[PDB]
Design a protein around this motif. Structure first.
Motif, PDB file in Angstrom:
ATOM      1  N   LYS A 175       0.801  -1.219   0.000  1.00 46.15           N
ATOM      2  CA  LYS A 175       0.000   0.000   0.000  1.00 46.15           C
ATOM      3  C   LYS A 175       0.842   1.283   0.000  1.00 46.15           C
ATOM      4  O   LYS A 175       0.300   2.370  -0.203  1.00 46.15           O
ATOM      5  N   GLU A 176       2.156   1.163   0.201  1.00 41.41           N
ATOM      6  CA  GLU A 176       3.025   2.345   0.282  1.00 41.41           C
ATOM      7  C   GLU A 176       3.032   3.185  -0.996  1.00 41.41           C
ATOM      8  O   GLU A 176       2.992   2.657  -2.111  1.00 41.41           O
ATOM      9  N   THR A 177       3.074   4.499  -0.820  1.00 41.14           N
ATOM     10  CA  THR A 177       3.239   5.412  -1.945  1.00 41.14           C
ATOM     11  C   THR A 177       4.491   6.247  -1.702  1.00 41.14           C
ATOM     12  O   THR A 177       4.699   6.792  -0.616  1.00 41.14           O
ATOM     13  N   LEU A 178       5.336   6.290  -2.721  1.00 40.88           N
ATOM     14  CA  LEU A 178       6.618   6.959  -2.666  1.00 40.88           C
ATOM     15  C   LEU A 178       6.471   8.482  -2.579  1.00 40.88           C
ATOM     16  O   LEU A 178       5.468   9.048  -3.032  1.00 40.88           O
ATOM     17  N   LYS A 179       7.454   9.142  -1.967  1.00 40.87           N
ATOM     18  CA  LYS A 179       7.449  10.601  -1.918  1.00 40.87           C
ATOM     19  C   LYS A 179       7.902  11.151  -3.257  1.00 40.87           C
ATOM     20  O   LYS A 179       8.829  10.631  -3.868  1.00 40.87           O
ATOM     21  N   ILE A 180       7.282  12.238  -3.687  1.00 43.04           N
ATOM     22  CA  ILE A 180       7.497  12.747  -5.036  1.00 43.04           C
ATOM     23  C   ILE A 180       8.935  13.200  -5.306  1.00 43.04           C
ATOM     24  O   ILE A 180       9.471  12.971  -6.401  1.00 43.04           O
ATOM     25  N   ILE A 202       0.381  16.424  -9.712  1.00 44.30           N
ATOM     26  CA  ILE A 202       0.323  15.825  -8.375  1.00 44.30           C
ATOM     27  C   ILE A 202       1.260  16.425  -7.335  1.00 44.30           C
ATOM     28  O   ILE A 202       2.337  16.857  -7.635  1.00 44.30           O
ATOM     29  N   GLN A 203       0.809  16.434  -6.093  1.00 50.50           N
ATOM     30  CA  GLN A 203       1.524  17.048  -4.981  1.00 50.50           C
ATOM     31  C   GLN A 203       1.566  16.255  -3.671  1.00 50.50           C
ATOM     32  O   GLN A 203       0.727  15.428  -3.396  1.00 50.50           O
ATOM     33  N   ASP A 204       2.577  16.538  -2.869  1.00 48.39           N
ATOM     34  CA  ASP A 204       2.706  16.096  -1.484  1.00 48.39           C
ATOM     35  C   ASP A 204       3.601  17.085  -0.789  1.00 48.39           C
ATOM     36  O   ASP A 204       3.955  18.076  -1.373  1.00 48.39           O
ATOM     37  N   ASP A 205       3.890  16.879   0.478  1.00 46.71           N
ATOM     38  CA  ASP A 205       4.713  17.820   1.214  1.00 46.71           C
ATOM     39  C   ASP A 205       6.140  17.952   0.693  1.00 46.71           C
ATOM     40  O   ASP A 205       6.767  18.971   0.872  1.00 46.71           O
ATOM     41  N   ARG A 206       6.654  16.885   0.116  1.00 53.09           N
ATOM     42  CA  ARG A 206       7.926  16.840  -0.605  1.00 53.09           C
ATOM     43  C   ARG A 206       8.175  17.589  -1.930  1.00 53.09           C
ATOM     44  O   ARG A 206       9.290  17.950  -2.208  1.00 53.09           O
ATOM     45  N   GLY A 207       7.189  17.712  -2.796  1.00 50.28           N
ATOM     46  CA  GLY A 207       7.380  18.183  -4.149  1.00 50.28           C
ATOM     47  C   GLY A 207       6.125  18.032  -4.983  1.00 50.28           C
ATOM     48  O   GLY A 207       5.044  17.738  -4.471  1.00 50.28           O
ATOM     49  N   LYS A 208       6.280  18.232  -6.285  1.00 52.57           N
ATOM     50  CA  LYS A 208       5.188  18.075  -7.226  1.00 52.57           C
ATOM     51  C   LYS A 208       5.701  17.476  -8.533  1.00 52.57           C
ATOM     52  O   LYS A 208       6.911  17.424  -8.778  1.00 52.57           O
ATOM     53  N   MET A 209       4.782  16.987  -9.359  1.00 49.34           N
ATOM     54  CA  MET A 209       5.181  16.321 -10.581  1.00 49.34           C
ATOM     55  C   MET A 209       4.029  16.263 -11.569  1.00 49.34           C
ATOM     56  O   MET A 209       2.868  16.284 -11.176  1.00 49.34           O
TER      57      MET A 209
END
Lengths: 191, 191
Positions: B101-106, B138-145
């Motif tokens: 279920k893990e999703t990698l950080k961007i 797409i986004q997360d606290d790490r970055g976007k792509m």
DNA sequence: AGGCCGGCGTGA
DNA sequence: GCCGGCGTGA
């Protein structure tokens, strides 16, 4: 790739002790690694002008210019200018601190692009000191991989089970898997 | 390519079947699945949609004549799927379930090797529907792509704050920037 | 497949 | 509708 004279205010989080390395032109030299932060980001920094080492453990707060930026890191050298701000300081968010100290998992490392620079702490499982090179087999709960050390990273004293902290290694692929290669400015310290 | 070494697994998830286009322009139907053993989990492309029931997940199954590439399994018409007996049963550690279920950080994704296949769940920040292609940011606290979607991955309805689940996207680099490119067997569902 | 250099379409 | 010509792709 060229220097950026746009000066930056950062805070020092860590330094390694000074260490000896050799240029391809066989010149003997001394440098140290450091990690610095802004409020929003962190940077790995190679400091080749070792006469600033005092400036990089105190004060924590500094201003840097004429440094080079490549490989997602900063190079500070003789042409670079480092100064102090004051007594006057700021603190850095823990997200950024933990990120700057973070070590990637080996399963993730195996999926990383060739040419990346890698910093981190790993467990030594096996070592083979050859004549010019030393293959350190490193391990974690996700996988294992080879670390090829030459120069200052050749023949380091260590035994299985010990933890190696790596600085400035180059990630390369064989065959379809990552390995970490020592380069001119790479360093290995023990814990 | 073909592995006749059969694998015994537990199905953790399937998508509904869906329509996609071949390069020779034939429309066909397939579905994605996630599978596990005691050891590790797999993303699976199932091109033979008449196997949907065998992948319902009530059972533990045995797969052979499957293709293994890009760190996934392809099960197709030439593959054999059957059921396991009463002693070949097993349960999968929550460790493995959660890893699956893990999703990698961007920010880590940006550093991944070109050509990697990527699955994951990400928060949508921004979307741009062009004529044939859709740029989902797409986004997360790490970055976007950027996620470039064409074919079945073009023009999907979603809005900012929705989470997109991506299946079998190709990581590509251009001008030193990473993107996720939708391909033939790629899929996007919303949450 | 090591990483590097050399061959097509896109758009001159 | 030109090629090169550079980061990509094996």
């Amino acid at each position: 790739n060229v220097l950026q004279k746009r000066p930056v205010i950062v805070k020092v989080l860590s330094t390694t002790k000074p260490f000896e390395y050799e240029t391809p032109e066989m010149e003997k030299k001394i440098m140290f690694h450091a990690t610095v932060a802004t409020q929003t980001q962190f940077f790995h920094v190679k400091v080749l002008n070792t006469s600033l080492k005092e400036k990089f453990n105190g004060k924590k707060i500094i201003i840097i210019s004429d440094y080079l930026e490549y490989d997602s890191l900063l190079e500070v050298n003789e042409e670079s200018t480092v100064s102090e701000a004051g007594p006057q300081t700021f603190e850095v968010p823990n997200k950024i601190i933990n990120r700057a100290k973070e070590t990637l998992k080996i399963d993730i490392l195996h999926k990383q692009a060739s040419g990346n620079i890698v910093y981190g702490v790993f467990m030594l499982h096996k070592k083979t000191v050859n004549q010019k090179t030393t293959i350190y087999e490193i391990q974690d709960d996700r996988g294992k991989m080879d670390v090829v050390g030459t120069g200052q990273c050749h023949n380091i004293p260590c035994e299985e089970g010990d933890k190696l902290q790596l600085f400035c290694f180059r990630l390369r692929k064989k065959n379809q898997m990552s390995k970490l290669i020592s380069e001119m400015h790479s360093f290995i310290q023990i814990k």
